[PDB]
């Protein structure tokens, strides 16, 4: 009887994430004030998050409820692979934004001359292809367990960026401290934002990825909660749309206009 609540909760999730993604996509467009070259990046973050659920979560509801993969050998490889591609990209983008800001905040005069939509589109296509090239090879449906692999992508999928953002963020904090040596009220405001932004991305995946990596050649016996970790990997997905947008009022203002 728990399956009814389990599927209800999963559908509620899916509805929340798709609603957030479509709301962000609507808000970013049809707004002269909000329009900016750096905003299209967020669109790409939504551009996958809009459909990843509809292409990943229901199949996960297909499995781990009755014990067997309903379909045959096909398509269990393209799904999984397809998972890793959609999923990897988000964690992938979520980096490029942070990387841009730091590029924008540091030496803004020089970087402002390179802010063109051509760039942005080149960055988008480059990140999409680098996600695809690491996803598609190779080549009772579960997750891959070949040692030559996971320890590989797991590094190139996460740790490629957690180091970046973490770094990019401490660096920014370093600069929100030099620049402001009222102000007292915002002193506890900006550090709280930065902490929230750096924490949301880490608290959810990191345990997953650290358990997934731990099951390499040198492994242990994780509890079954591990399944617990797996969804966490998703709930972060539904989040980005909110976590990034509610802290930039133009976005607010757009949300207020569209919702009222």
């Amino acid at each position: 009887q728990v399956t009814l609540t389990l599927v209800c909760l999963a559908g509620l999730l899916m509805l929340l994430t798709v609603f957030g993604n479509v709301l962000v996509i609507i808000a970013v467009f049809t707004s002269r004030a909000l329009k900016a070259p750096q905003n299209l990046f967020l669109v790409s973050l939504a551009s996958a998050d809009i459909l990843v659920a509809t292409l990943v979560i229901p199949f996960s509801l297909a499995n781990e409820v009755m014990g067997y993969w309903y379909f045959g050998k096909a398509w269990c490889e393209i799904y999984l692979a397809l998972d890793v591609l959609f999923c990897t990209s988000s964690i992938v983008h979520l980096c490029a934004i942070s990387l841009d800001r730091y590029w924008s905040i540091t030496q803004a005069i020089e970087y402002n001359l390179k802010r063109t939509p051509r760039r942005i589109k080149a960055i988008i296509i480059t990140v999409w292809v680098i996600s695809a090239v690491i996803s598609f090879p190779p080549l009772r449906c579960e997750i891959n367990d070949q040692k030559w692999y996971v320890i590989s992508s797991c590094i190139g999928s996460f740790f490629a960026p957690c180091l970046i953002m973490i770094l990019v963020y401490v660096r920014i904090y370093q600069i929100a401290k030099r620049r402001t040596r009222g102000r007292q009220n915002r002193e506890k405001r900006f550090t709280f934002v930065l902490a929230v932004v750096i924490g949301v991305f880490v608290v959810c995946w990191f345990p997953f990825f650290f358990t997934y990596t731990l099951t390499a050649v040198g492994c242990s016996v994780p509890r079954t909660l591990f399944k617990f970790f797996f969804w966490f990997g998703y709930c972060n997905s539904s989040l980005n749309p909110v976590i990034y947008t509610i802290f930039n009022h133009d976005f607010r203002r757009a949300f207020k206009k569209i919702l009222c």
Binding site: R101, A108, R179, R189, V193, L194, V197, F247
Partner: peptide, 16 residues
């Protein structure tokens, strides 16, 4: 001018 530009971009993350 560069200080104003920095205060603005920094603004977007806002952040702030």
């Amino acid at each position: 001018v560069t200080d104003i530009i920095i205060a603005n971009n920094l603004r977007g993350c806002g952040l702030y």
